[PDB]
């Protein structure tokens, strides 16, 4: 079925076979999908955790002074393969291919004053 | 079937029969193959290992002084048989025909203050 | 398949399922179909007639002075 209805903070993935390219897809609308493509699956819930809270995602986006998303002609997102991503909090966010999800919903690394952290 | 998705940051052989030549295609077409050609393989990873993190290969490619990469005129890749070749990190690259992949995904060697390294 | 051989001076037609919209194809290249396409028919050669001979078609494109074509 071409119709693809997306509650309103989540996202889903699409390979376009023409141009032989995933993407992202984001918002309440139900972006029904085009002749070429293929929906990768159901949709998800935005990645999200709570303030004082963290997450770890492999493979980030690149991004400028602006932090704008730096798209590629071809149709892939940009991707620092061998780097990592961590995040505490912000707005909700789609999960952008080719990323891989590994830490989440984690608790901040509370530290209580008579103990310490070491470090390498 | 003629038609050969590629996703964005991979990789694939070759073989064009007809000048009897091998070569790595890139990049996120679906590069269809030609009459005189014959794909080696499914899609795969570009070689890729993290910051402070190494890998080694066989048989590196020359390159100049803008490491250029040197095409034969023939279509082969130029290649240093006899010699090796070694990487921390840099952007993601397609695998050369001809090369022999070896270590890969190794973590850089930690040297901890009390220890040494003797060598040969 | 995919593949589509064209015959240097031939001509196919195909439907962009995606756009919906329908596309000729002209010259020797064996323009390979992409996903969201699909082709209409084999290829065919390409209506001619001889000098002093003459043929009339249906449906005509628009042209400009250039009598350039107005996609």
Chains 1, 2 share one sequence.
Do not use: W
Request: some cysteine; charged content about 20%.
């Amino acid at each position: 079925e071409a119709i693809i209805r997306i509650p309103p903070y989540h996202y889903i993935h699409v390979l376009d076979q023409n141009s032989n390219v995933s993407r992202v897809e984001v918002g309440p609308k139900t972006y029904i999908r085009q002749d070429n493509e293929r929906v990768l699956f159901a949709p998800v819930r935005m990645v999200t955790v709570p303030p004082r809270h963290y997450c770890i995602v492999a493979n980030p986006v690149s991004r400028d002074t602006q932090s704008s998303v730096l798209f590629d002609i071809t149709g892939q997102v940009r991707l620092r393969h061998a780097d990592q991503e961590i995040r505490l909090a912000q707005d909700p966010f789609p999960l952008y291919p080719g990323e891989v999800l590994e830490k989440d919903i984690t608790p901040l690394q509370v530290v209580l004053p008579n103990t310490a952290l070491h470090l390498k």
